[PDB]
Fold Insecticidal toxin protein TcdA4.
Amino acid sequence: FTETLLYRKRYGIDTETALMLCNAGISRISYDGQLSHFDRLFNNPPLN
Amino acid sequence: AKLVLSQDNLDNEISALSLANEQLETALMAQTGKTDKNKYYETLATSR
């Protein structure tokens, strides 16, 4: 958690990118009613 | 009648055009009997 706060403090990133730097897995599950990180990474839009 | 009332259905925004496309796909693939999507666009690639 404190690495997440530091890696957000420097580099000025979103907190989920700082979590992905902090060795966290890609979530298939939609958080707070948007596209999930797996789907917004791969299927936005689905290719062909 | 299948539709579920939830806070996610009330709050989250979707593309209306994508919903129209899904509503037409779920009828056309039910007419042709094929359950795949990309197979249906492959058989739609040649049709006149």
Summary: DSSP finds three helices and no strands in chain B.
